[PDB]
Subunit: 228 residues, 3 copies
Amino acid sequence: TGRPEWIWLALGTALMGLGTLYFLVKGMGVSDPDAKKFYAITTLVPAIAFTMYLSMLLGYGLTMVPFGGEQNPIYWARYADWLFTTPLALLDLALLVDADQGTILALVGADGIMIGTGLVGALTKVYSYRFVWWAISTAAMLYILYVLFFGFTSKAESMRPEVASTFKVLRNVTVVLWSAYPVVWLIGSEGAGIVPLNIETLLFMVLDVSAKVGFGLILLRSRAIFGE
Amino acid sequence: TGRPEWIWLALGTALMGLGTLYFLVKGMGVSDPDAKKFYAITTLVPAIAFTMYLSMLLGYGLTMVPFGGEQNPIYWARYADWLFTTPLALLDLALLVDADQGTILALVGADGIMIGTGLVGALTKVYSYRFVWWAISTAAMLYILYVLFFGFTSKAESMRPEVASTFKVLRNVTVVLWSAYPVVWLIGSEGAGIVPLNIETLLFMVLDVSAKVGFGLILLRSRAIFGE
Amino acid sequence: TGRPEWIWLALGTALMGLGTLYFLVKGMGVSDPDAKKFYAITTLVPAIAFTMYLSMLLGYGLTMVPFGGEQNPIYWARYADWLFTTPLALLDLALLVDADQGTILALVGADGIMIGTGLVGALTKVYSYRFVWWAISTAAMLYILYVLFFGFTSKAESMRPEVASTFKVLRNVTVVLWSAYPVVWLIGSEGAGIVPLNIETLLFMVLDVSAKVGFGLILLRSRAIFGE
Ligand SMILES: CC(C)CCC[C@@H](C)CCC[C@@H](C)CCC[C@@H](C)CCOC[C@@H](CO[C@H]1O[C@H](CO)[C@@H](O)[C@H](O)[C@H]1O[C@H]1O[C@H](CO[C@@H]2O[C@H](CO)[C@H](O)[C@H](OS(=O)(=O)O)[C@H]2O)[C@@H](O)[C@H](O)[C@@H]1O)OCC[C@H](C)CCC[C@H](C)CCC[C@H](C)CCCC(C)C
Ligand SMILES: CC(C)CCC[C@@H](C)CCC[C@@H](C)CCC[C@@H](C)CCOC[C@@H](CO[C@H]1O[C@H](CO)[C@@H](O)[C@H](O)[C@H]1O[C@H]1O[C@H](CO[C@@H]2O[C@H](CO)[C@H](O)[C@H](OS(=O)(=O)O)[C@H]2O)[C@@H](O)[C@H](O)[C@@H]1O)OCC[C@H](C)CCC[C@H](C)CCC[C@H](C)CCCC(C)C
Ligand SMILES: CC(C)CCC[C@@H](C)CCC[C@@H](C)CCC[C@@H](C)CCOC[C@@H](CO[C@H]1O[C@H](CO)[C@@H](O)[C@H](O)[C@H]1O[C@H]1O[C@H](CO[C@@H]2O[C@H](CO)[C@H](O)[C@H](OS(=O)(=O)O)[C@H]2O)[C@@H](O)[C@H](O)[C@@H]1O)OCC[C@H](C)CCC[C@H](C)CCC[C@H](C)CCCC(C)C
Ligand SMILES: *C/C=C(C)/C=C/C=C(C)/C=C/C1=C(C)CCCC1(C)C
Ligand SMILES: *C/C=C(C)/C=C/C=C(C)/C=C/C1=C(C)CCCC1(C)C
Ligand SMILES: *C/C=C(C)/C=C/C=C(C)/C=C/C1=C(C)CCCC1(C)C
Ligand SMILES: CCCCCCCCS[C@@H]1O[C@H](CO)[C@@H](O)[C@H](O)[C@H]1O
Ligand SMILES: CCCCCCCCS[C@@H]1O[C@H](CO)[C@@H](O)[C@H](O)[C@H]1O
Ligand SMILES: CCCCCCCCS[C@@H]1O[C@H](CO)[C@@H](O)[C@H](O)[C@H]1O
């Protein structure tokens, strides 16, 4: 349909779409109030992802940013997505572990700064400044990952085995997947064009589908979502 | 003052404005913590509506979108309004019925997607794509209306008669009024210019004032807002 | 680095930055769940402030708005900041006083309208309309300050002496500092160029650092954050 990345944008749209329908069907009939929350948070994530990928496929989520002299194609839609989508995931983890409201707020705020800053960076005209924002964004992410890995884990150890083990898997998955985004951003169209928009869109696609559908699958198929 | 719809924008500004002052006065002195919530949610709704209509009257909430060849006047302010305003209404219904947090979250998310998608649609350059977004938006709305009509009603039947009956009226009103927006959008300046911006603004005005002031009146005048 | 206000933007960036690090260090090791909330809300405030000042220093948070004929430099970043930052402060006050959810919602909404309206005003092309938005914004602020001064105080009197006294100081500080913003706006680049962007940025800088770091200091150093 034009841009060479369109295909990956198309597959992501479809996969996020199918992931949503699958979770909607699976959560059908669930009466446990605690399970309801998990199904609602986890299903909304890909749902949002669906709408944003579609805006990128249709060309809407793409804008033009000048820097480095030449012209640059920046998909701003990703930030619109991640803005609500990363915190929701954090909410799933927090509920699983029964995190204190104080830490949930700190984590959501750090997330908002992470994405807000990432977005600013992506739209900054002075090529050199874009990295400053990257550094601030990455620092916010490391703060989140630090709390998830050391703070939540400890909270998870006070739960029953099924809950503790599922949190462990989800924790490992988010830490690994999340840390890949700033790398992809840095070596891609947003930072250094070392990697073509072509290959980047493919990476974000695998990362996103894994972080949402995959994450959703691991969580929604375990009995950890039931308070018992 | 220029555009032929200005008058309806003016009456809406005034009515939303008067509706706010009226509710502010009526909620004065209320000490019941549960009633306070209802008064706060219900009063903020028209208050937000006030500010957005004014931006449309003054020309600020109007932008220009190219599609179908010719030029199109799109009031984006409505989405800014509805973005916070539709969920608040959902919150009133949820409190009345004491809905589970899981469903409140799902409903607020579906609402966010509904408006976010509606906005995208309204600002899309490819005339044909605008309808795709309409379809997604309408699907989100039908999901909300489905849960309100069948899920909330059942929750409402566990409450005392005054609460159950008031929820019934509000439920009927929102289902009917809400379903009219996508129709108006489709046959109006946002979709097919079958209906002139002139008549459309009049429709949204009646719909909005009914959905907020009317809804506010029905709710704020019943003892259903008191937990007893 | 160009614009004459750059220096104040630089000092604000640094002070907000140092204020965040200081609070992050101070809140380290705190286990009280109630203290955690206060530290999270109070630390995020300057953190957000940091990111926005930096966007203004680097030129990103500055835009051009035509009105009064001549050209006008408007830093929109301040609203992006205040949008999340003013409510957080309100949340600190509400927790301290254990305010009803209804009033917290009303206050957050009034705040959202205050900033949203202030932003609209700042970006309006018709010089005369900018003041209409100012008036609406100021009315929302007075509503907040009224509730904080008379409503919260009363709520504060049911708490122990340390809490009541700390709320008193914070209450006095916010009322005074908050009321200065609409004055600065009115006599500055946003309204009447009586005061040069040079002196204005200096004022907002002192006001902001006082409202956040100062406020943070007064609150985070008292035992009022401990539910005991
Ligand atoms: C309502 C919604 C739910 C609120 C969501 C939160 C919101 C605050 C933030 C999302 C954050 C952030 C990522 C967005 C900000 C980034 C910013 C830089 C981009 C803004 O653009 C997005 C705007 C579109 O603007 C368009 O309209 C205006 C006015 O009419 C135009 O002035 C502007 O130019 C338009 O831009 C579009 O077109 C551009 C095209 O550029 C060129 O234009 C010329 C014509 O002039 C030619 O057509 C060129 O063609 S050619 O010659 O080159 O061939 C053409 O290139 C593009 O470049 C632009 O990219 C753009 O397409 O819209 C706002 C989007 C909304 C807010 C997204 C909704 C997202 C989703 C549904 C949200 C669900 C959220 C829900 C609330 C979660 C609930 C969670 C619960 C708690 C659980
Ligand atoms: C802070 C606030 C509380 C946050 C609210 C949430 C926010 C994320 C989203 C609202 C969602 C969504 C609907 C908005 C996105 C849609 C997007 C496409 C529109 C963006 O425009 C809105 C911007 C204005 O941009 C303007 O400034 C920039 C920078 O200076 C310009 O680049 C831009 O062009 C400007 O656009 C205005 O002017 C345009 C004029 O076009 C032409 O311009 C030329 C000059 O170049 C000539 O003047 C032309 O004249 S002529 O020749 O034709 O004769 C002229 O036509 C217009 O076309 C544009 O439409 C526009 O007027 O501002 C952002 C608005 C804010 C966010 C709205 C605040 C709303 C309300 C107060 C919110 C209350 C919320 C509260 C938080 C709820 C709490 C609830 C509790 C939980 C209970
Ligand atoms: C994701 C984030 C967390 C969501 C935050 C909430 C969000 C809904 C609202 C913030 C509210 C409000 C204040 C913003 C709306 C105001 C609006 C008018 C301004 C919009 O601009 C901001 C956009 C940038 O747009 C830029 O990109 C588009 C698309 O590519 C361009 O079309 C647009 O023009 C760009 O504008 C920038 O550049 C302009 C430059 O103008 C001229 O441009 C030419 C080239 O064309 C030349 O370069 C000129 O140079 S020269 O010749 O004159 O020499 C040049 O002047 C500037 O004028 C513009 O000002 C702008 O720089 O981005 C959106 C910003 C994001 C959303 C901010 C993130 C803020 C922070 C990190 C948020 C933390 C929030 C967290 C969620 C809190 C959690 C709290 C818990 C509950 C506790
Ligand atoms: C479903 C989407 C997910 C889980 C997205 C996660 C995204 C991130 C962890 C993004 C992080 C970034 C930085 C740390 C700095 C560079 C800019 C970003 C936004 C790519
Ligand atoms: C006070 C305002 C109210 C109750 C607004 C309700 C608005 C809707 C239910 C809008 C729905 C739409 C669709 C279903 C698709 C077409 C686009 C919209 C946003 C008009
Ligand atoms: C950390 C930042 C703080 C405490 C900011 C407070 C800002 C205000 C109270 C702003 C108020 C305004 C009006 C009342 C109308 C004029 C426009 C504003 C946004 C400057
Ligand atoms: C475009 C529409 C997007 C809709 C996103 C909604 C996510 C809904 S999850 C769903 O929420 C119900 C509460 O309504 C629970 O009862 C179910 O068990 C649970 O699975
Ligand atoms: C521009 C200003 C917009 C303000 C919107 C605020 C809606 C306030 S409702 C009001 O909230 C109080 C708590 O403060 C309760 O005590 C009252 O009973 C109730 O009626
Ligand atoms: C760019 C990163 C911005 C991060 C902002 C986070 C504010 C964190 S406050 C911190 O939150 C912890 C919970 O994680 C509590 O345990 C600590 O006692 C408290 O002091």
